[PDB]
Amino acid sequence: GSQKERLLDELTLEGVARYMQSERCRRVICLVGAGISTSAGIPDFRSPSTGLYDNPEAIFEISYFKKHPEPFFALAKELYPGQFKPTICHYFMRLLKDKGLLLRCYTQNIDTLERIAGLEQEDLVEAHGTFYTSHCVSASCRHEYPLSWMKEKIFSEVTPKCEDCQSLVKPDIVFFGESLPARFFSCMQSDFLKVDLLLVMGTSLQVQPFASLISKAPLSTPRLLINKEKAGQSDPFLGMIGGGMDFDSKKAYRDVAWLGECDQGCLALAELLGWKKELEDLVRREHASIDAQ
């Protein structure tokens, strides 16, 4: 129940692939972040070279947005990509859904690539909101605006204003300082009771409370991390005063770490599972379709 039993035959990608092929594994939760859309032209924060942090969190604090909203709309013009193509990792999460293996994708990302890849609302907890819709900030109005409209205003370089009441129109994201959506808490309440595999991709696990989601799995739920760096290990100091990631100690029993590009790592997993051709065809067919329209 809260007991530590080993379900992977070994702490490797192949271990995880065998486990996923088994009956015990029916219900997968993905946790994802900016690492899964870096190769889609959207920078993360923590990457030395191409990360936003140095190319700083003020521009995403509410109290600074509240005072000065212009710098953020200016940034969003900058980073607003020329076209929206999801990555191999996005489409890997697609295959999961289509094979009825995906219970939920919990995402820190606000880029909508998960929906474009064809994850539905039901499948998706967008824990930091999204640019998909936008709303008026005026509580008496709260008129809802699509991404097509929001883009017209950001690219126009006019601060978006509601056409009914002329209030600021806000993209629908959770800034730092703001409370997460309710549906995040109530989904977590239910999902982590019944998760069979915890798959974690392209996140540093530094933003709370989203990071604490890994400790909500049952203690015998395997957890696979696909990322450029280990993440989610208990800190030696903050731990001093639980359920962090343990890939390495002699007490490792269920946590695996594949370190590299998510696109390669997901492509590797897919191949073990005999989904490689299915993945290539999907990505290629979906990207061509995006190129056509």
Partner: peptide, 6 residues
């Protein structure tokens, strides 16, 4: 809890 780097 609110969003925070931590």
């Amino acid at each position: 809890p609110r969003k925070q780097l931590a």
